[PDB]
Amino acid sequence: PLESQYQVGPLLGSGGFGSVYSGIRVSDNLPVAIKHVEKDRISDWGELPNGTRVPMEVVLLKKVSSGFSGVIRLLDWFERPDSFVLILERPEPVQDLFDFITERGALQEELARSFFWQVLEAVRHCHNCGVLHRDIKDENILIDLNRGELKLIDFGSGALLKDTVYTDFDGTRVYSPPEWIRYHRYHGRSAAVWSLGILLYDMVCGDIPFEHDEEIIRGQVFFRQRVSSECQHLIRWCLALRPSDRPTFEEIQNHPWMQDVLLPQETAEIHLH
Ligand SMILES: Nc1nccnc1C(=O)Nc1cnccc1N1CCC[C@H](N)C1
């Protein structure tokens, strides 16, 4: 049973994603996160190779499963009569990117470069494994404060990556691209790159560039903080109105603003000490 295998701690958060609790695996004292999701609230249903219908997140997290620290690890999962329980890895000490930016304001470009690079490495790993996250944002990024390593969380709005159009979306509207707003249509990679541009603006400015549909559609970027010309260029390129004008992950990582990234441990030493 789940109740004998894990010691339940405080609620870490709840919302559209369900309810997430801090926990401890009783056997080895390993820190875990216990995620509960009600069956009636599930947006994307997946199918396990053995045939059983599970939340898409269970399918997606199994697809990415490796020694790669950039994606939160699924440790175990359970079915209950009206819900699913997901046992996830829990870094300690940890802080999500949203709380980190709230406490510190706009980040130094060196810090933003290190964090953005790790998000890109994590997203590239998902895509290479046939997984599309669909809800890339500061709230879905965990910072391992000791190691300076970032992890992607919440694959509950995700899908299997495909080359055809998506007509469904249940991620964050303010991170969604203008083709979703205008037409209820987007392609995986170019929509992911748009959300990445919103994320990078958020990191260097301390807030998102757009709040309303009209602003997303217009796509005019205003810099409220001092941001280098190379960083402003990368942001505007990710935020191109025409999806095909957006850079590939390779063009992003080869961008001159992305050069000479710090190692995660150098990041923890300089910026998280
Ligand atoms: N593994 C974790 N370790 C520490 C903290 N959180 C998580 C987590 O999975 N969180 C999570 C999963 N699915 C949806 C939302 C989640 N968050 C809950 C805490 C607040 C965070 N912004 C979102």
From Swiss-Prot:
Which cofactors does this protein require?
Mg(2+)
Q: What protein name does the entry list? A: Serine/threonine-protein kinase pim-1
Q: What induces it?
A: By interferon-gamma (IFNG). Strongly induced in leukocytes by the JAK/STAT pathway in response to cytokines. Induced by different cellular stresses, heat shock and cytotoxic agents.
Q: What is its EC number?
A: 2.7.11.1
User: So what does this one do?
Assistant: Proto-oncogene with serine/threonine kinase activity involved in cell survival and cell proliferation and thus providing a selective advantage in tumorigenesis. Exerts its oncogenic activity through: the regulation of MYC transcriptional activity, the regulation of cell cycle progression and by phosphorylation and inhibition of proapoptotic proteins (BAD, MAP3K5, FOXO3). Phosphorylation of MYC leads to an increase of MYC protein stability and thereby an increase of transcriptional activity.
One family name in Pfam for this protein: Pkinase
Tell me the residues on which Phosphoserine occurs: S66, S229
Q: Which reaction does it catalyse?
A: L-seryl-[protein] + ATP = O-phospho-L-seryl-[protein] + ADP + H(+); L-threonyl-[protein] + ATP = O-phospho-L-threonyl-[protein] + ADP + H(+)
Q: What class of enzyme is it?
A: transferase
Its family remark reads:
Belongs to the protein kinase superfamily. CAMK Ser/Thr protein kinase family. PIM subfamily.
Protein kinase domain spans which residues? 6-258
Positions binding ATP in this chain are: L12, G13, S14, G15, G16, F17, G18, S19, V20, K35, E89, D96
Q: Spell out the GO cellular component terms annotated for this protein, sorted alphabetically and separated by semicolons.
A: cytoplasm; cytosol; nucleolus; nucleoplasm; nucleus; plasma membrane
**Species per Swiss-Prot/TrEMBL record:** Homo sapiens
Q: What is the effect of changing L161F?
A: Decreased kinase activity
